Write a protein that binds this ligand. Structure first.
Ligand SMILES: [Cl-]
Ligand SMILES: [Cl-]
Lengths: 155, 163
């Protein structure tokens, strides 16, 4: 791996919103989906695994760096992935909202000395709260996420 | 081709700081350097950028002059680039200083709706301009052919337009 992108999110649940970001990253050697430590962590991990299967994109894997680090800061996460892959160049994938407020992040300056920070457009716009509310309300969520994820959510 | 990164800068003059950003973009199919419009005249900056590209020896980098053609906000520039390469995915590249000032860009939010924005780390131009005016060594600030052109034409120290 030379170019590694790491995309942290609640993935609560993974949605077509996340997919619209992740599918833009085909030029990276490895794209790591790191679920943050309401759906509990083990279920979110299973949902992310289903999501990855559904997307069928060769460069995407789930990462669990927060598990050994466990609050877990972006800095700590990037430091850890850099230690695992010393020869790689690391890119942190962020939402635009956080991109605009990055100066407030713990060790923001230090991050910008070491690593790339990338905001990808959210071409599909879906709030997690809206999906989880749809589940409670009993409405169809098949167009909100990928098929295996939706099957797992209903169960 | 499919992944195109655009890096705008004054390139006034191109430095090892610019190189540190551009060399991180090997994963893009094409990287376009767009010089913007103590400011050296645009055609001279273009000449420096051409030498800089040759010096870096990175096969995916080209100079682009679409700003000259539009004579220009980032928003307008990206719209034009998307027009020229309609099937490409475009990423706009900035360094840390513009990164923390990005909200101030014209239609910054609309940019993020349409295109990827990437802030690359500075691992390594105003220091060069200062060293040239004072006769100090610049060989550690820029690439060899750029240094040659800066000195030979008396850029900054004696002229800004070469006229
Ligand atoms: Cl989420
Ligand atoms: Cl500059």
């Amino acid at each position: 791996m030379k170019k590694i992108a790491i995309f942290g999110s609640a993935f609560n649940p993974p949605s077509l919103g996340h997919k619209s970001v992740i599918e833009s990253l085909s030029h990276f050697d490895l794209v790591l989906l790191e679920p943050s430590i309401m759906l509990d962590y083990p279920i979110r991990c299973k949902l992310v695994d289903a999501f990855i299967k559904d997307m069928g994109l060769s460069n995407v894997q789930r990462s669990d760096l927060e598990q050994a680090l466990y609050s877990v800061t972006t800095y700590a996460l990037l430091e850890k992935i850099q230690e695992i892959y010393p020869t790689a160049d690391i890119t942190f994938v962020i939402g635009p909202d956080n991109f605009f407020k990055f100066a407030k992040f713990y060790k923001a300056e230090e991050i910008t000395e070491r690593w790339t920070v990338m905001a990808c457009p959210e071409k599909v716009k879906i709030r997690s709260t809206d999906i989880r509310n749809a589940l409670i309300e009993g409405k169809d969520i098949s167009t909100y996420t990928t098929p295996t994820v939706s099957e797992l959510l209903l169960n």
